[PDB]
Amino acid sequence: MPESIDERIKAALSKRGIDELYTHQYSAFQYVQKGESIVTVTPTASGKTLCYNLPVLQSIAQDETNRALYLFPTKALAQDQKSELNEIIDEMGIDIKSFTYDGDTSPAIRQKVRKAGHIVITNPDMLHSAILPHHTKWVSLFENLKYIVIDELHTYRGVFGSHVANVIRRLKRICRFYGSDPVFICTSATIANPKELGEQLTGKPMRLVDDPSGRKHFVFYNPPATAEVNELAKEFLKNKVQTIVFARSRVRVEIILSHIQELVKKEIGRGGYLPKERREIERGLREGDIVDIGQLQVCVMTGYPGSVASAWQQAGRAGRRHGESLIMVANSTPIDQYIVRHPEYFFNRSINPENLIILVDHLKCAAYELPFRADEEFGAMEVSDILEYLQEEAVNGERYHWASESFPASNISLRSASQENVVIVDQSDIANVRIIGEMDRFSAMTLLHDEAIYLHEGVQYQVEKLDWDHKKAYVRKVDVEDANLAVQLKVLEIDKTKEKSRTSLHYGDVTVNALPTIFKKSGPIHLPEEELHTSAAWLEKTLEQLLLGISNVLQHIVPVYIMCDRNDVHVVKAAHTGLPFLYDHYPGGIGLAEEVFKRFSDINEAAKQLITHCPCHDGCPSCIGKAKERILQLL
Numbered sequence: 001m002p003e004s005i006d007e008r009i010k011a012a013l014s015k016r017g018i019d020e021l022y023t024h025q026y027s028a029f030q031y032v033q034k035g036e037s038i039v040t041v042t043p044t045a046s047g048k049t050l051c052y053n054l055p056v057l058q059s060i061a062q063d064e065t066n067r068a069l070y071l072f073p074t075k076a077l078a079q080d081q082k083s084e085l086n087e088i089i090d091e092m093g094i095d096i097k098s099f100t101y102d103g104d105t106s107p108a109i110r111q112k113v114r115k116a117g118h119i120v121i122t123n124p125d126m127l128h129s130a131i132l133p134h135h136t137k138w139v140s141l142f143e144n145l146k147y148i149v150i151d152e153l154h155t156y157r158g159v160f161g162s163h164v165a166n167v168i169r170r171l172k173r174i175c176r177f178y179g180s181d182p183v184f185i186c187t188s189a190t191i192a193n194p195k196e197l198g199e200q201l202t203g204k205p206m207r208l209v210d211d212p213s214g215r216k217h218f219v220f221y222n223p224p225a226t227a228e229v230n231e232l233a234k235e236f237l238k239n240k241v242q243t244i245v246f247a248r249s250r251v252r253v254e255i256i257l258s259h260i261q262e263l264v265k266k267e268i269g270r271g272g273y274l275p276k277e278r279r280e281i282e283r284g285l286r287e288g289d290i291v292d293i294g295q296l297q298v299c300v301m302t303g304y305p306g307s308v309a310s311a312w313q314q315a316g317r318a319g320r321r322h323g324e325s326l327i328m329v330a331n332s333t334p335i336d337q338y339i340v341r342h343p344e345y346f347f348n349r350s351i352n353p354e355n356l357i358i359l360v361d362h363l364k365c366a367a368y369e370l371p372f373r374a375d376e377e378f379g380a381m382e383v384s385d386i387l388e389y390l391q392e393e394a395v396n397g398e399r400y401h402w403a404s405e406s407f408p409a410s411n412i413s414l415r416s417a418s419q420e421n422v423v424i425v426d427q428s429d430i431a432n433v434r435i436i437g438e439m440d441r442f443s444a445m446t447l448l449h450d451e452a453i454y455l456h457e458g459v460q461y462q463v464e465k466l467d468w469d470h471k472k473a474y475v476r477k478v479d480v481e482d483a484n485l486a487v488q489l490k491v492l493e494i495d496k497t498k499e500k501s502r503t504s505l506h507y508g509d510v511t512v513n514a515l516p517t518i519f520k521k522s523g524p525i526h527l528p529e530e531e532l533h534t535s536a537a538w539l540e541k542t543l544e545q546l547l548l549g550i551s552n553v554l555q556h557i558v559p560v561y562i563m564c565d566r567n568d569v570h571v572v573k574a575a576h577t578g579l580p581f582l583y584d585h586y587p588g589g590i591g592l593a594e595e596v597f598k599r600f601s602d603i604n605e606a607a608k609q610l611i612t613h614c615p616c617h618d619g620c621p622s623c624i625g626k627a628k629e630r631i632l633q634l635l
């Protein structure tokens with residue numbers, strides 16, 4: 001082992017015993033010390049937090065005047081990582097103070113951690129809202145902000161991805177002023193474009209790290225869900241096999257765990273969780289009867305968790321050292337049945353800051369937190385003439401307010417393009433009236449319309465009311481367990497066009513309108529409407545029905561490859577070109593069309609194979625809702 005690494009760290013890691021010269025940790029540390037940003041796809045069982053901890057703590061131990069900044073999604077994960085690294089600081093013995101700076105920290109120590117904390121953990125919302133606008137009170141952080149750590153990079157996508165990219169633009173701008181360009185260390189999971197997603201974020205050409213421990217078994221069956229998973233778990237427990245099941249929604253967890261718990265507890269005799277009891281359960285699991293919290297012997301799932309990365313991660317939570325283990329049951333849903341009938345995405349792998357509205361919002365924010373100068377750029381967005389129409393307002397531009405409640409950041413809620421959008425309030429029980437979700441204008445028109453069928457994470461809901469003039473959905477949770485809208489459209493421009501074999505493929509910008517019309521399951525509804533300018537990638541009555549079938553195929557195939565919500569983008573003679581339309585949901589380009597521009601060839605090939613190998617008769621209700629081969633030979 002090279003003696004370049006600090007011997008304090010070497011001995012502290014030799015105490016626990018993980019001194020193995022490992023592959024991905026080596027490739028990460030070497031080329032992070034070299035100065036190149038990295039993105040890793042290593043699982044939790046292999047490397048986990050150490051791959052980004054080790055270079056950070058090495059730089060902290062070398063020069064005491066070094067600071068690190070972490071991006072973790074929630075306050076619970078912030079506290080978890082803080083405790084995990086505080087344990088290693090304790091084993092190291094070096095006077096290093098690392099804390100979290102989020103909404104639930106004691107104010108008596110906030111100034112302290114601003115003046116003396118080495119590592120600072122903070123979620124993007126709190127970061128953007130408080131830390132960067134008051135970067136003055138963070139001088140000591142930004143003068144020596146060497147590294148920037150990001151956990152779960154795939155969560156930063158869509159509107160959240162664009163907003164976080166703009167926040168990191170502001171962050172790098174502040175660092176440029178304070179003279180401390182940081183190298184970026186991003187962690188993620190199994191996605192199709194890990195390096196391509198890491199490059200566009202910060203505009204840095206970071207490298208991706210892909211790299212016996214036995215072999216893990218895979219299950220590909222479907223019973224003709226809760227009770228069946230319970231029976232599988234009870235078989236494993238009768239055989240005395242360490243088993244883990246994965247229910248996501250807390251309510252489903254409580255129900256299934258009540259079943260399993262009464263049974264097994266009579267046999268054997270998340271968010272709201274705290275780090276003390278978390279470490280107690282870790283102790284129990286890894287050195288008792290029932291973060292390296294422990295290693296499981298078999299993994300049981302509960303449907304496709306709506307993410308390629310999340311499924312692989314929850315599968316990788318289990319594993320042994322030089323041993324074998326086993327890995328999912330679908331439900332009465334075409335999406336889970338589809339991911340069952342499509343295991344071809346497992347042998348290997350299976351967004352746009354150019355949105356001008358978010359650009360204007362973050363321009364206002366940056367102008368508040370740091371004055372601009374038009375004489376330098378790396379190649380990002382900074383056209384000064386556009387940066388100069390932001391002027392006064394006689395009778396939205398800037399708000400030169402001398403009051404205190406008004407703010408430039410104000411309503412710029414980056415979690416879901418919440419310029420002005422709806423907030424969801426659960427009216428099931430008054431005691432703890434749970435305010436849960438938030439949704440854009442058009443997204444709420446599509447989903448949260450009054451008296452709808454809302455499904456929020458395996459739990460059924462029912463919309464009671466929607467205050468549209470103040471954007472507030474009031475819903476009711478149901479245990480007894482569709483929608484529609486259509487109107488005209490207009491076009492703008494095309495920045496990417498084709499002419500291949502009569503079938504021209506265009507990508508550009510358009511402007512659409514809205515109208516709720518009716519909803520399915522059988523009722524009409526009206527709501528005030530507004531236009532929407534965004535990017536879009538696109539290409540007698542029997543032909544209209546054929547195009548409707550094509551639209552069904554696309555609506556059921558596109559969310560898979562783009563890995564987004566099913567109700568993000570929406571599929572549509574056209575007056576633009578005289579003959580007969582994917583468009584982005586949220587105002588402005590969000591990559592949901594440029595990714596289609598990139599991968600439309602493979603999308604069309606997969607559509608061919610899907611419409612051919614569908615277990616039906618020339619079209620299934622889950623794919624179309626000899627027309628099959630006619631569609632095939634037309635496309």
Ligand SMILES: [Zn+2]
Pocket residue numbers: 611614615616617618619620621622623624
């Ligand atoms: Zn079919």
